[PDB]
Write a protein that binds this DNA or RNA. Sequence first.
RNA 1: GAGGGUGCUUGUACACCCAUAGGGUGAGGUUAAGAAUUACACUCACUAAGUGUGAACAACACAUACAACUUGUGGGAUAUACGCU
Lengths: 87, 365, 346, 49
Amino acid sequence: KEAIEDIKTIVHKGNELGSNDTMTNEIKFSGELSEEQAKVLKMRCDLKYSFSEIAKELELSEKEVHQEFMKAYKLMKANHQLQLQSA
Amino acid sequence: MGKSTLKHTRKIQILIDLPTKDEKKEVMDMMYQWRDRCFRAANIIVTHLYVQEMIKDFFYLSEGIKYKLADEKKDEKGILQRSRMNTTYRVVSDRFKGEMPTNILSTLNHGLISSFNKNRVQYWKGERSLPNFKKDMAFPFGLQGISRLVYDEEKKAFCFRLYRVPFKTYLGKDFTDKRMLLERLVKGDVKLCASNIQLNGGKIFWLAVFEIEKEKHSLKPEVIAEASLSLEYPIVVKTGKNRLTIGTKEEFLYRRLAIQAARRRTQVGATYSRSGKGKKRKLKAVDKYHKTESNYVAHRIHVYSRKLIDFCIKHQAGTLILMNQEDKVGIAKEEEFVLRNWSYYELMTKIKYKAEKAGIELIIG
Amino acid sequence: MGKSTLKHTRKIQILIDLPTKDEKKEVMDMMYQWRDRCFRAANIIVTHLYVQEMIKDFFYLSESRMNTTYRVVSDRFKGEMPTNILSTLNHGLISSFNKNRVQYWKGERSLPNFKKDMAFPFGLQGISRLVYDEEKKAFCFRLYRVPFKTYLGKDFTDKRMLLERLVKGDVKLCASNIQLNGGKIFWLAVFEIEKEKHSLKPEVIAEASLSLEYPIVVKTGKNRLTIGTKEEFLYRRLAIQAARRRTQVGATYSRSGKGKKRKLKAVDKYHKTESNYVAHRIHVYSRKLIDFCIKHQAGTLILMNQEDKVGIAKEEEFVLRNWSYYELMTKIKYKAEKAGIELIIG
Amino acid sequence: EYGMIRIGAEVKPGDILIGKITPKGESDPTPEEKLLRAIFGDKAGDVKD
RNA sequence: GAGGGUGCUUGUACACCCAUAGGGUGAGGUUAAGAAUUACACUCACUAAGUGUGAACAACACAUACAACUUGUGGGAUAUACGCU
């Protein structure tokens, strides 16, 4: 049983990292885009400002700015997918 | 002006430029002595920078005294008779002078005293043990010691002195990679930092911290590269319609585990090997697997990070995002296989430094 | 001429012998505060002891040896922390620094410090009424005015036996330690046990068998030991055979005319050394077999034929083959009475 | 629940009307099959459409 | 045939060799035995490796392909093999 379990860990624990990726929850990111996230996304994509510059301008931490930008990208991707499905 | 450079380190092999064997052996023995003195030094400095803080704590428990590390000539509450780094440098030089150079002492002193102040937080509460430096340590030498750097065309090697000893540098078949790097210093064009030196059983290596600059490409911040890292596919990257999968489960995890299994095989087989001549000869075969799988993992990680950076630059992806990396760190933490078979901190740090070099801004989430 | 008494360390679980949850909570808090005080005391004692020992290298400041530091730490932590543990700690650090002061001064080893999770020490005087309790099934005692009962859990190991000999006085106890790892209080007890003179007792049976990947297997009571492993025995054999093949290939393609002996002495010796390899192998295998026989006081050892027919066998050839390969049987017979154990037949 | 199409559904070509599972033909459980099921799982449960 | 030496460092493979190198030994301490002698996962250490020139175990010259080349130091933690119960 131990040998079988080691073979199991060798096979499936290498696929368990990607199993969560394939089983990612389909979070309904259909809510209105927050002002801070929208400003961060506009600065990074349109104004072409570095995230350090965004943090300096908005008086926010670099990690928080990065999290807000990733959230903004996530809900914009969800909205774009919804628009493509409806068009 | 901001730091327009990212620190970088290179390994340069050096042979001793002497005609006869005995002079080379004398120099090599002197340098081994330098290693031993450097390690004993590091121990002396760390002990001497531990004790005084606990004397401070003793006085504070005595009468709540506000004793602080400062020269008494410049502070009423100061106890030190000079600067702290000077105290450690003195208490090591008074004993080890005349055998090994003092620039090693200065570099080691700075390198430890800078870190210990940051570790003060962990040391007042107590979650960290005092360092016990090894014996095979690469000993440090400052830039104030490199001298007589030239290119001797007759011997086809750069010549220099590491504190009054000639040294012919062995680039070998490296006429491009680091070749125009030492010449970039003989003509005063590249900046060098406090370097180190290693010796691994006959060969001599110089770990030179050359300060290299960033590379500017044609990158678009709006274009985003979606990177994910898993143990089945080490890197999977999206860029619009372009997909790249770097690494295979067989070439990273399976070979790593094969090296581990071979090491266990030799460990098992060493019990009944030649006996009665000591533990060292029994574990001789184990000694072969010193940094085998670490080297393999480092090389594959370098290759994978280079391919990721190349793909991101070639598609002008000015912002690289690691998807769900926090959750994967969380699951890896509460596991055993994932932590001890999937180097994600090494991959993350290689990606971070190789993307901060190319201007790509890296995001984790 | 080693010490006749061996030192062992066991980690048991200990719970506070107070009926209500509240009292257990204050006692756990008191244990944690004791550990904190012990940490601070150990740090200060080691620091000032190194300070006093290294006075001539301590000129960068502005301005027995036991008693001073012990007195300061005692007046620092009196009442809140019973002084017996403090004195035991102080003696322990002064003994350890005496042990490795030579490498202290040369700088080969740094100053060993302490952390927030070091098991604080305590001697015998702390423990009182070291007896056994059967009604509640816990070896009970009283440490520093606090009764203490152990939650051994499902402990089927030798911890129960060791505790049973300890309470009866059959085993002496040394300066032990208490740890508070993850809430569950643990006791690291160091026992000084007299090495009983092991003698031949011809009433136990030792079971020796040949195997397929686990060579000689020996079973006695609740104990088992294997002498080697299959790939272990086959590694040198494979290396020797392959090297013999390539040496033969090189010799057949080498320069001839200098004598057939000069051409094939290595070829013959490479096959010859295999015999010495297997002879030394049987030697060390029988040596370990006899070592178990003597170690576990076994008086009778018997080697199964264990041959069967068809089934699983008759296809795999057995590592070490039958019980006569290279006079294996003989090499355990002549060795047997060499030590005294009775290896008869099976 | 009984694998039977609902009243009001549109039977486009190729849709399942009455789903059914028939016990598949397990031969003698050879050791290789036993190990493969032990480690991978019973993905190929014994049921045919 | 693994594993290695030289071919700057790492990985793969590659030419030339070494390779019973998971071996051949030396010394010190200790143990057991009447002795020979054995023993130690006790300690320390030595010994093999391209071609040519070269008296030479001196020195020097020459010696394959792709990819990568930011490391070093320390702490916390886990596990593997071995030894004891």
